[PDB]
């Protein structure tokens, strides 16, 4: 009865690009985190501020499940205090993070012959992202002293870039799917608990 729809997020058909990372609210359900931590289909399963074993016996105000797709090595950037293109311009976790980062290889689902160009990442931004910020603007980034005048050109580039997931790519450049579970505890009724 009234379990939490984790299957909706993990087993989703299509995943949003990292720059437009899709957040799902989790409230008013019982959470069986076992389904996650008892599975071995995961490439990286790291948790900050809480243990996955001690999850089923905890209550929180709200739980957010952010989901997106990045490349193999860039998975490192989904962790508190990290730098890089993804962590600065796409998806930044707070230094005082209390959650779990779960990522797994999805080369079969996300890549195709001639490369898949449906997955983007933001390469340029005027400033680094605040934690849990989303910038989907497509303003031509002004890299030099030239005005750019809303048209790409000399020192004027499109802010987003295509990943280009070839099936023949190395493990480091293969598409991985990431889900970030954030467990916020405010001065509110704890509406999410386990057994």
């Amino acid at each position, epitope marked *: 009865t009234n379990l939490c729809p984790f299957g909706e997020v993990f087993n989703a058909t299509r995943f949003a690009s990292v720059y437009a990372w899709n957040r799902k609210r989790i409230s008013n359900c019982v959470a069986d985190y076992s389904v996650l931590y008892n599975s071995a289909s995961f490439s990286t399963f790291k948790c900050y501020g*809480v243990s996955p074993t001690k999850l089923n016996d905890l209550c929180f105000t709200n739980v957010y499940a952010d989901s997106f797709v990045i490349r193999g090595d860039e998975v490192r950037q989904i962790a508190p*205090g990290q730098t890089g293109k993804i962590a600065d311009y796409n998806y930044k976790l707070p230094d005082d993070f209390t959650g779990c980062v779960i990522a797994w290889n999805s080369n079969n689902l996300d890549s195709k012959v001639g490369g898949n160009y449906n997955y983007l990442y933001r390469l340029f931004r005027k400033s680094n992202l605040k934690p849990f910020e989303r910038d989907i603007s497509t303003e031509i980034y002004q890299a030099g002293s030239t005005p750019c005048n809303g048209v790409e050109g000399f020192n004027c580039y499109f802010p987003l870039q295509s990943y280009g997931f070839q099936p023949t790519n190395g493990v480091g450049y293969q598409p991985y799917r990431v889900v970030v579970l954030s467990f916020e505890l405010l001065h509110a009724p704890a509406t999410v608990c386990g057994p």
Partner: antibody
Amino acid sequence: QVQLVQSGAEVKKPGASVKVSCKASGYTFTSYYMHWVRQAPGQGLEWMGIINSSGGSTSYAQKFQGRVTMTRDTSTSTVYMELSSLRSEDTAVYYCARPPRNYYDRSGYYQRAEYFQHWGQGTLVTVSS
Amino acid sequence: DIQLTQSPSSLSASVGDRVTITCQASQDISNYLNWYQQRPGKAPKLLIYDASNLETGVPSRFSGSGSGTDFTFTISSLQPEDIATYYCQQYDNPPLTFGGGTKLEIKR
């Protein structure tokens, strides 16, 4: 931008004490461990200890046990390291270093990640008459 | 106390040469090894962590591998700005220790 600013270089007479400061800026201070690393002129790097910015728990190396003291102030987001009973071997540059956060395994195993991403500029301590 | 030996202690290679350094541990540390690139006067700069993972912002020409007691650090094509002293570090068991260092120079 993350920044570790250490105190000025000092000269101290043998047997005295030095206190070196490391001020963290550009990240939540109470969410990472701070480690100290000393490097003698011309020699290699040598580990000194770890301090917990949150609770203040401290673990020093056996070589410095009883002579090194690590202090922390949350309000100013700074870490102090004091070495007493200085000798000619202690003339070196002292770095603070921040590693990333230690994470939990899928199984629930505490996995330490003690690689140093951010370093201070270094504090030279010259021990001389 | 885990001892680390670095081979060699010094070396000189030409521009574009492939460079390889070895770090041997007195005990088994699975891959809890890191590589730092300390330039003269500056602080150490982390290039490789977990003995095989490239740190965000490091050129593709750098690599590391190894396990158990033996690790290797490799530079594909030696670029002029790569001149520094390279150290290895372990964190499998306290206390942390560093290698002897490998002063790398350019043949010009």
